[PDB]
């Protein structure tokens with residue numbers, strides 16, 4: 001289970017994956033969006049890591065709450081309300097339990113509530129769901145994460161900016177799905 | 193039937209009525225529009241009178257085409273396209289005939305084609321149709337024109353800016369119907 | 385009652401307010417567009433701001449794209465003001481609601497009219 | 506193909522083109538609003554010009570209010586350029602057309618999507 005120190009470790013590694021791959025995420029957001037997802041996430045996570053440095057946390061719930069508010073303020077696209085609400089729910093769950101699948105469950109439920117996406121609609125919901133299912137079957141892995149990211153290409157987008165492209169969204173990897181893969185891949189590294 | 197001279201007289205008279213009543217026309221356009229009908233028409237008709245001073249027309253058709261194209265350019269709401277199309281059709285008709293009822297017919301037809309309105313929809317169509325039947329039945333009069341202006345108050349607007357107010361458009365005289373009344377009463381003044 | 389406009393664009397927000405002011409001079413009206421840097425987008429903070437800036441306690445709200453709606457939803461959950469978020473065209477919906485509100489339409493009649501223009505945002 | 510936006514507002518027109526340029530950098534895109542003096546309104550001469558100014562010969566066109574439509578319809582009868590006038594929401598409809606056209610959707614496919622969002626203007 002996560003702790004104050006490994007949570008801060010996890011988010012730092014996530015910020016690193018985000019900064020490293022920011023051009024790629026915005027590239028993914030080109031054919032099926034407005035070409036800003038990487039930029040959006042880089043800003044939000046740079047600001048998040050700044051905000052975590054100056055604060056002194058009593059618990060993990062506090063960390064998640066700080067993540068939620070920073071992303072909600074500093075990300076100007078859909079990923080803001082989405083990740084922000086994911087982290088907010090995880091913040092509330094963390095007061096009572098730091099069980100990894102319980103947290104992810106809180107986050108998924110909140111993303112689905114916020115954006116109203118079902119599984120298979122070509123959004124980050126797809127990987128949040130696949131990753132939780134894997135944790136519940138003790139089969140979560142980076143390989144399985146990458147599988148979901150690649151699988152996102154074949155789907156028709158029915159939510160968000162991508163949905164405006166109809167059939168022309170098929171053949172393009174979803175940027176939020178990719179940024180969510182980085183999230184879980186770094187999680188697995190520190191949590192295992 | 194109109195001549196070159198009584199056409200120029202008509203339009204000068206019409207312009208005078210518009211300038212003198214521009215505030216009332218915009219006032220009528222308040223509760224069921226954006227409060228500009230008077231100013232659109234005033235703009236359109238001063239420009240039209242300027243245009244007629246600098247030209248030396250060879251027939252009535254030529255005058256109508258000039259009016260048509262000036263109002264199209266210089267009336268800047270819904271009334272421009274409609275009066276514009278009206279005078280343009282009348283221009284074409286004026287080549288074969290200067291029978292007043294045939295001119296009003298062509299005008300009414302172009303307005304209906306342009307704005308898609310039927311009689312009873314609280315627009316200027318209502319008075320163009322009534323004025324036409326009046327000419328045909330040899331019963332056209334000022335009193336019969338005010339009849340239809342006053343009668344527009346109780347019609348539900350199903351076209352134009354007025355239509356956004358639904359039933360809240362009832363109890364309000366249509367500004368386009370009023371400006372078309374001035375058009376027709378000044379015509380009856382000079383046509384005989 | 386008041387009207388709130390949320391757009392990805394500061395220019396759309398500004399131009400729509402002016403369009404609307406021509407038919408609704410006296411209504412309580414707020415428009416917000418874009419992020420704090422003038423770039424295209426929407427944020428929780430700015431949506432919340434527009435909600436609290438509006439003089440009214442019961443707010444009819446309008447947006448362009450889905451992520452703007454999400455920010456309205458979030459604000460709705462955090463304010464004691466009563467927000468209705470309408471899944472209708474931004475320009476045409478806000479314009480319809482404002483003109484009606486100016487002219488004295490009831491809330492119910494406005495909603496009746498907006499129900500008629502529901503689009504899959 | 507080309508996209509023409511016609512608004513009563515210069516700021517809507519400008520804001521909408523910017524929003525759209527984020528998803529359609531390469532399309533022929535013309536956006537006009539307001540009168541010559543920048544006041545709220547629709548100038549026939551500007552609409553006519555904007556149809557000439559666009560480099561394409563088949564034009565997908567969008568408007569806010571009924572009078573804007575009438576200018577488009579007038580201009581349509583006065584050129585050999587093929588105009589389609591879409592009776593759809595200005596922001597949502599123009600955004601949809603522009604995104605689809607940038608991604609290489611056919612005219613027919615764009616029309617099929619826009620038919621889904623027809624409003625009573």
Ligand SMILES: Nc1ncnc2c1ncn2[C@@H]1O[C@H](COP(=O)(O)OP(=O)(O)O)[C@@H](O)[C@H]1O
Pocket residue numbers: 029033034036037038040041076077078079080082111114115116117122123124125159160161174175176177450451
């Ligand atoms: N309604 C939704 N539900 C769940 N996820 C969504 C929704 N809309 C968008 N997303 C996610 O957001 C990502 C795009 O994020 P970003 O580009 O930052 O926002 P925007 O689309 O506003 O520019 C998509 O790749 C998708 O995974």
Ligand SMILES: Nc1ncnc2c1ncn2[C@@H]1O[C@H](COP(=O)(O)OP(=O)(O)O)[C@@H](O)[C@H]1O
Pocket residue numbers: 221225226228229230232233268269270271272274303306307308309314315316317351352353366367368369571572
């Ligand atoms: N579709 C239409 N068909 C016929 N007449 C119309 C139509 N739309 C508007 N009108 C007329 O135009 C008048 C409004 O003129 P004006 O205020 O100058 O234009 P706008 O409504 O664009 O500001 C109305 O009073 C009505 O008589």
Ligand SMILES: [Mg+2]
Pocket residue numbers: 029033034035036037077
């Ligand atoms: Mg994006």
Ligand SMILES: [Mg+2]
Pocket residue numbers: 034036076077078424425
């Ligand atoms: Mg964006």
Ligand SMILES: [Mg+2]
Pocket residue numbers: 221225226227228229269353
């Ligand atoms: Mg008007």
Ligand SMILES: [Mg+2]
Pocket residue numbers: 226228268269270546
């Ligand atoms: Mg007007």
